């Protein structure tokens, strides 16, 4: 029956990305902003390989990101949807039922501004999922989720419009 309680779409996780192009203090400041916003120690990402044009080298710490789950993820997400005035694009939704957007200033989110920290833009991505995804992530007896139980683009767009009363344009 398609209207089962366990088929309920719900957020699995939100991943926070700041891809500062350099190393040192600025990346440290991005980690500090992420630690302020999420309340969790973020993780620093190292370049997988070297590009001279971008001014990065392999294993130079370039970006920082953090993953939040549960009620806090919803709160940070709605704080970010406020900046977008609740208006996403059709393209912003992946074929796997995940969606994301990117803010340009982190003080629009509603945190204190510090001249020493400066402003960082921030990138948001949400992993959608119903109950039972642990099947594909548990250690023992790992399997795949059947096609009907999968999240797809249309179900997520309709769920987002209903739960947030927003509009997803398609320019």
């Amino acid at each position: 029956k398609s209207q089962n309680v366990m088929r309920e779409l719900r957020i699995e996780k939100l991943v926070l990305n700041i891809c500062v192009g350099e190393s040192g203090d600025r990346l440290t400041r991005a980690a500090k902003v992420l630690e302020q916003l999420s309340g969790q120690t973020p993780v620093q990402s190292k370049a997988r390989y070297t590009v001279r044009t971008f001014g990065i080298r392999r294993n130079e710490k370039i970006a920082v990101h953090v993953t939040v789950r549960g009620p806090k993820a919803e709160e940070i997400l709605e704080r970010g949807l406020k900046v977008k005035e609740y208006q996403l694009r059709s393209k912003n939704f992946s074929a796997t039922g995940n969606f994301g957007f990117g803010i340009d200033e982190h003080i629009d989110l509603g945190i204190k501004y510090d001249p020493s920290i400066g402003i960082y833009g921030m990138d948001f991505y949400v992993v959608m999922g119903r109950a039972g995804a642990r099947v594909t992530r548990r250690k023992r007896a790992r399997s795949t989720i059947g096609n009907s139980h999968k999240t797809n683009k249309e179900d997520t767009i309709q769920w987002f419009k209903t739960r947030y009363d927003a509009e997803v344009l398609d320019k």
């Binding site: 120690t41 973020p42 620093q44 990402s45 190292k46 390989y49 590009v51």
Partner: peptide
């Protein structure tokens, strides 16, 4: 503090395929 660890076994490379400005 905490950093993502490497999963890609092509640890010793130089640049990357796919990269080639023409695309």
């Amino acid at each position: 503090k905490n950093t993502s660890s490497k999963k890609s076994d092509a640890a010793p490379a130089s640049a990357d395929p796919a990269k080639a400005k023409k695309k």
